[PDB]
């Protein structure tokens, strides 16, 4: 009954369904950096070489 | 003349190369690399690469 | 034995759109072969989503034959009266028939009886091993964890060194799948020496895995000893592209060559990380770690460099280097400041008692937190 008290008082802030109102309405980030780097290294190389 | 001795002497070169350098820079701090280079009797750049490794 | 692992390795390739079209369709043939042969029809159903009626007939037949066979066989093995020998064996076999067709559910029930019913500790461990392999199969990791937690209790009970080895190698794979590489390495190096394969991948696979972890976690001195001078690696040379790439990277990392390091970075990505199932998901994460590590390595030995020197050495332009250093500086690993006006790369190193002071307070906040809540709970009760 301590637990029951918690859930009831809380309800008015939760209203109808602050639980399902919202969904009814609606290095790990960084992309493949291998590709960028591949191309960088060859673009450097080329110039280096013909200089 | 001794094939076993000869082999182990290249290795000896290398572990001793260390021994000489350490002794030279032990008292100093902020020692010029030119000073090291003369004593050991090996070129400037060669030494930089060894030291960086060490 | 061979399909039990091998199917998942190929299947993974197929899933992926990263893979070259040549590889994708090379694997496609391999998969289809083994379906018909091991009669995987239930499980095949699972995989098709993720990817003739004769197949189905092959199920229906093989099933009713295999079922009727084992039925009365098992029925008779229970009837004629002694459970130690026959009833225990019969449940093993029952789990195995479910594991072939990949029904997970009916195997949990059969291999569970075998464990409950009194038998040698050897006998217990051996049987559990199959359940864990089905977890690995399904590509659910947490299913493997619960089982292998039990297996670990029984390891020193039985005391067979044979099964201590086998246990190590399963737990090795589970850990390769999770981020945590630290436990993986320890287990993995020992197992190069020793492990007769059982319901898990070939020794060529296992070789590339020890090389990969070794780079990541190991201190410098210890990479040289245990890996380069490995008796195992040296005899095994390279009879595979994957093993070759990773080996080439190791030699330049140790030798402090930097020009060739970057070609090599790119190679291992193509030929190692994407074929391997477990390390595919960590492809981004690995290359990040490695790129911090090398930059770091060089900065440790130099108080200063100029931008031109450092960039020419790695083989990237000066502009490409600058954008990349500054990624990793606020995450703290390279420990360097950069002057733009004088072009210089300073390297600050102020790690001392200060470093260690911050680690202890942060982790400390967390022990306080847990404690407060469990205290409150019990007091009410």
UniProtKB/Swiss-Prot annotation, chain A:
Any GO MF annotation of the entry: molecular adaptor activity
Cellular component annotations (GO), alphabetically ordered: cytosol; proteasome complex; proteasome regulatory particle, lid subcomplex; proteasome storage granule; transcription export complex 2
Knockout-associated phenotype: Impairs mRNA export and transcription elongation, and induces strong transcription-associated hyperrecombination phenotypes.
Highest taxon, organism lineage: Eukaryota
Keyword list, A-Z: Acetylation, Phosphoprotein, Proteasome, Transcription
BP terms from Gene Ontology: double-strand break repair via homologous recombination; filamentous growth; maintenance of DNA trinucleotide repeats; mRNA export from nucleus; positive regulation of transcription by RNA polymerase II; proteasome assembly; proteasome-mediated ubiquitin-dependent protein catabolic process; regulation of cell cycle
Note: Present with 5590 molecules/cell in log phase SD medium.
Family assignment from sequence similarity: Belongs to the DSS1/SEM1 family.
Biological role: Versatile protein that might stabilize multiple protein complexes involved in diverse pathways. Subunit of the 26S proteasome which plays a role in ubiquitin-dependent proteolysis. Also associates with the TREX-2 complex that is required for transcription-coupled mRNA export, and the COP9 signalosome, which is involved in deneddylation.
Assembly mode: Part of the 26S proteasome. Associates with the nuclear pore complex (NPC)-associated TREX-2 complex and the COP9 signalosome. Interacts with CSN12 and THP3.
Name of the protein in question: 26S proteasome complex subunit SEM1
Included stretch of the parent chain: 17 to 89 of 89
UniProtKB/Swiss-Prot annotation, chain B:
Post-translational modification: N-acetylated by NAT1.
Highest taxon of source: Eukaryota
Annotated function: Component of the lid subcomplex of the 26S proteasome, a multiprotein complex involved in the ATP-dependent degradation of ubiquitinated proteins. In the complex, RPN6 is required for proteasome assembly.
Family: Belongs to the proteasome subunit S9 family.
Assembly description: Component of the lid subcomplex of the 19S proteasome regulatory particle complex (also named PA700 complex). The 26S proteasome consists of a 20S proteasome core and two 19S regulatory subunits.
Additional facts recorded: Present with 16800 molecules/cell in log phase SD medium.
Identification of the protein by name: 26S proteasome regulatory subunit RPN6
Organism of provenance: Saccharomyces cerevisiae (strain ATCC 204508 / S288c) (Baker's yeast)
Name of the coding gene: RPN6
Portion of the full-length sequence here: 327 to 380 of 434
UniProtKB/Swiss-Prot annotation, chain C:
GO biological process assignments: proteasome-mediated ubiquitin-dependent protein catabolic process; ubiquitin-dependent protein catabolic process
Single Gene Ontology MF annotation: structural molecule activity
TPR repeats: 88-121
Pfam family, one: RPN7_PSMD6_C
Coiled coil: none
Top-level lineage group: Eukaryota
SMART domains for the chain: PINT (SM00088)
Gene3D superfamilies the record matches: 1.25.40.570
UniProt KW tRNA-binding keyword: no
Keyword line: Nucleus, Phosphoprotein, Proteasome, TPR repeat
Keyword Heme listed: no
Residue ranges constituting the PCI domain according to the UniProt record: 180-352
Function, in words: Component of the 19S cap proteasome complex which acts as a regulatory subunit of the 26S proteasome, involved in the ATP-dependent degradation of ubiquitinated proteins.
Additional observations: Present with 51900 molecules/cell in log phase SD medium.
Subunit (UniProt): The 26S proteasome is composed of a core protease, known as the 20S proteasome, capped at one or both ends by the 19S regulatory complex (RC). The RC is composed of at least 18 different subunits in two subcomplexes, the base and the lid, which form the portions proximal and distal to the 20S proteolytic core, respectively. Component of the lid subcomplex of the 19S RC.
Designated name of the protein: 26S proteasome regulatory subunit RPN7
Species, as recorded: Saccharomyces cerevisiae (strain ATCC 204508 / S288c) (Baker's yeast)
Gene label: RPN7
């Amino acid at each position: 009954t301590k637990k029951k008290n918690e859930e009831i008082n809380k309800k008015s802030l939760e209203e109808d369904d602050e639980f399902e109102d919202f969904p009814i309405d609606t290095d790990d980030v960084e992309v493949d950096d291998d590709f960028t780097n591949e191309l960088k290294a060859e673009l450097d190389r080329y110039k280096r070489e013909n200089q | 003349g001794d094939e076993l001795t000869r082999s182990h002497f290249n290795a000896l070169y290398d572990t001793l190369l260390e021994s000489n350098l350490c002794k030279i820079i032990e008292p100093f701090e902020c020692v010029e690399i030119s000073h090291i280079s003369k004593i050991i009797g090996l070129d400037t750049q060669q030494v930089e690469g060894k030291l960086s490794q060490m | 034995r061979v399909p039990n692992y091998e199917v998942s390795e190929k299947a993974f390739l197929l899933t992926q759109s990263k893979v070259s079209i040549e590889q994708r369709k090379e694997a496609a043939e391999f998969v289809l072969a083994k379906i018909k042969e091991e009669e995987m029809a239930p499980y095949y159903k699972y995989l098709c989503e993720e990817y003739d009626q004769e197949l189905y007939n092959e199920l229906c037949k093989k099933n009713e034959s295999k079922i009727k066979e084992l039925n009365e066989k098992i029925q008779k093995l229970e009837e004629d009266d002694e459970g130690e020998l026959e009833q225990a064996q019969a449940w093993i076999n029952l789990g195995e028939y479910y594991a072939q067709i990949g029904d997970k559910d009916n195997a949990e029930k059969t291999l569970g009886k075998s464990l409950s019913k009194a038998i040698s500790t050897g006998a217990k461990i051996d049987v559990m091993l199959t359940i864990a392999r089905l977890g690995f199969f399904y590509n659910d990791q947490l299913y493997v964890k619960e089982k292998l937690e039990a297996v670990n209790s029984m390891i020193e009970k039985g005391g067979d060194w044979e099964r201590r080895n086998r246990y190590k190698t399963y737990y090795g794979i589970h850990c390769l799948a999770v981020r945590n590489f630290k436990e993986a390495a320890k287990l993995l190096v020992d197992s190069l020496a020793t492990f007769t394969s059982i319901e898990l991948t070939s020794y060529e696979s296992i070789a590339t895995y020890a090389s990969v972890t070794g780079l990541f976690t190991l201190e410098r001195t210890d990479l040289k000893s245990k890996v380069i001078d490995s008796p195992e690696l040296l005899s095994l040379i390279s009879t595979t592209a994957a093993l070759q790439s990773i080996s080439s990277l190791t030699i330049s990392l140790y030798a402090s060559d930097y020009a060739s390091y970057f070609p090599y970075l790119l190679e291992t990505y193509a030929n190692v990380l994407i074929p391997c199932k477990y390390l595919n998901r960590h492809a981004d994460f690995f290359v990040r770690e490695m790129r911090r590590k090398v930059y770091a390595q060089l900065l440790e030995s130099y108080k200063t460099l100029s931008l031109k020197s450092m960039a020419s050495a790695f083989g990237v332009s000066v502009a490409f280097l600058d954008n990349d250093l500054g990624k990793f500086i606020p995450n703290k690993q390279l420990n360097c400041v950069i002057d733009r006006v004088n072009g210089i790369v300073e390297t600050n190193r102020p790690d001392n008692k200060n470093a260690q002071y911050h680690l202890l307070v942060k982790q400390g906040d967390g022990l306080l937190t847990k404690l407060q809540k469990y205290g409150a709970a019990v007091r009410l009760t």
